[PDB]
């Protein structure tokens, strides 16, 4: 099955998922001098006050924190978006070294990691339907650089020992995702795809300008997760990122100047 290794990684994915070579694939490089300020872009509306976290899971490709999305509790609106998108899950992509790990890049610069807050358009009723639509998902992408610790990340870091291997999960209630956001909601936006198989072209990408800082100890604990399951030889979960894909016939827009 697909993964991030030499024999099953991003260069192989197109054989099972031919849309890998499609017209709106993610991630991309954000060339900051070529992105155009769009004064008609509204401010983002991130309404996470009522967010209800559920469980944290190692799925063998990342770890994911899930949310109750059966009501409008944690929603993303505004920006380039029409309508209301419910928070389903967040997860990360990260590197083996601090100079790599993000999926999007900024003027070819790679960050140590990238947070994806995944939301789906409620007019499609459920996330499975939404993934089949060009405006079905909105993913808020946030870069991580290594420096000062991010206090709002620490409860995530604390529990990773209990989900070390593929297939493990733990009860992760009462987590506040607002503690993962930077100060500014300035953003770039473009139409794209899921960055993991099936690579569906269903995502409005919203990538924040301002990275969050995390400590070396925090990201080191990401790197101690395992791709393997329990009772298998250890393979460290690192470098779970897809590289930048051709921009093709797309323009990246900026909410700021
Ligand atoms: C928790 C959950 C439940 C269900 C029914 C579906 C999903 N699927 C999902 O979140 N897919 C997805 C894959 C890749 C990205 S990325 N890496 O482009 O942000 C986002 C969502 C996730
Ligand atoms: Zn992702």
């Amino acid at each position: 099955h697909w993964g991030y290794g030499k024999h099953n990684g991003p260069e192989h994915w197109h054989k099972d998922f031919p849309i890998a070579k499609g017209e709106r694939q993610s991630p991309v490089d954000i060339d900051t001098h070529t992105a155009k300020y769009d004064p008609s872009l509204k401010p983002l509306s991130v309404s996470y006050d009522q967010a209800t976290s559920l469980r944290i899971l190692n799925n063998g490709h990342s770890f994911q924190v899930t949310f109750d999305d059966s009501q409008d509790k944690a929603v993303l609106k505004g920006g380039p978006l029409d309508g209301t998108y419910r928070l389903l899950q967040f997860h990360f992509h990260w590197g083996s070294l601090d100079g790599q790990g993000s999926e999007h890049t900024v003027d070819k610069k790679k960050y140590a990691a990238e947070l994806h807050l995944v939301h789906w358009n409620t007019k499609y009723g459920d996330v499975g339907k939404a993934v089949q639509q060009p405006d079905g998902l909105a993913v808020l992408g946030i870069f991580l650089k290594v420096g000062s610790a991010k206090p709002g990340l620490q409860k995530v870091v604390d529990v990773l020992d209990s989900i070390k291997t593929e297939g493990k999960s733990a009860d992760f209630t009462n987590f506040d995702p607002r503690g993962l956001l930077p100060e500014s909601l300035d953003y770039w936006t473009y139409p794209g795809s899921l960055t993991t198989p099936p690579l569906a072209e269903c995502v409005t990408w919203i990538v924040l300008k301002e990275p969050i800082s995390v400590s070396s100890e925090q990201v080191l604990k990401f790197r101690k997760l395992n791709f393997n399951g329990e009772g298998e030889p250890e393979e460290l979960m690192v470098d779970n990122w897809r590289p930048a894909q051709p921009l093709k016939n797309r323009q990246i827009k900026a909410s700021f100047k």
Side-chain angles (χ1 to χ4, degrees):
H1 303 292
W2 65 272
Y4 294 93
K6 183 63 173 172
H7 297 286
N8 66 351
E11 299 320 303
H12 291 279
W13 293 353
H14 71 93
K15 290 178 286 182
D16 278 337
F17 304 96
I19 198 169
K21 294 178 181 294
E23 297 300 313
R24 54 174 287 177
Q25 289 287 299
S26 295
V28 300
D29 179 60
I30 298 167
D31 190 276
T32 61
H33 291 98
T34 297
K36 187 182 172 64
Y37 169 73
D38 183 355
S40 65
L41 288 171
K42 291 159 60 185
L44 290 175
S45 177
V46 182
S47 295
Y48 294 168
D49 183 66
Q50 296 294 103
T52 299
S53 62
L54 301 170
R55 334 232 327 143
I56 185 167
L57 173 65
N58 180 335
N59 61 13
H61 306 288
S62 67
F63 65 90
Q64 177 183 285
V65 172
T66 58
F67 293 79
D68 180 9
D69 62 351
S70 67
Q71 286 181 278
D72 292 351
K73 291 180 175 180
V75 299
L76 179 65
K77 296 169 62 180
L81 302 171
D82 292 343
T84 301
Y85 294 64
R86 289 180 185 168
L87 178 65
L88 177 39
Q89 58 107 329
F90 66 80
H91 61 275
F92 301 77
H93 304 272
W94 61 91
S96 59
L97 300 171
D98 293 347
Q100 73 195 40
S102 65
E103 288 191 331
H104 295 86
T105 57
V106 179
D107 292 336
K108 301 297 180 65
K109 175 184 168 63
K110 295 171 167 118
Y111 286 87
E114 180 172 342
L115 168 60
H116 292 162
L117 290 148
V118 176
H119 310 79
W120 57 274
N121 190 333
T122 60
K123 70 180 181 180
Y124 296 126
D126 74 46
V127 64
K129 288 288 184 62
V131 170
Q132 302 178 341
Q133 313 306 323
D135 58 351
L137 270 62
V139 182
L140 178 61
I142 300 174
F143 298 115
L144 279 62
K145 63 180 180 179
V146 175
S148 296
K150 186 67 170 173
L153 180 61
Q154 188 56 43
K155 288 176 176 180
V156 174
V157 168
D158 287 338
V159 69
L160 295 180
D161 284 341
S162 68
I163 60 162
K164 182 179 180 181
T165 52
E166 181 270 328
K168 287 187 175 299
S169 66
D171 169 276
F172 204 68
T173 55
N174 301 116
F175 179 77
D176 185 351
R178 293 175 297 185
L180 298 174
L181 302 178
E183 296 180 355
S184 178
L185 294 179
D186 288 346
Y187 62 88
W188 296 281
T189 184
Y190 76 97
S193 71
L194 305 179
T195 67
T196 51
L199 301 173
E201 287 178 342
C202 60
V203 179
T204 299
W205 277 97
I206 297 166
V207 176
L208 295 185
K209 170 193 74 181
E210 178 178 354
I212 60 170
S213 294
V214 303
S215 65
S216 58
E217 293 84 7
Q218 288 177 326
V219 66
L220 185 295
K221 293 184 179 180
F222 293 187
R223 294 175 185 156
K224 286 180 174 176
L225 291 170
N226 294 160
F227 291 123
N228 48 303
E230 187 181 5
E232 297 173 350
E234 191 174 14
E235 289 295 324
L236 296 179
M237 182 178 286
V238 293
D239 283 326
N240 56 352
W241 52 277
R242 190 190 190 185
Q245 301 298 310
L247 184 63
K248 291 181 178 177
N249 190 35
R250 291 174 292 180
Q251 292 177 335
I252 298 171
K253 290 186 173 181
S255 72
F256 63 98
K257 49 191 178 288

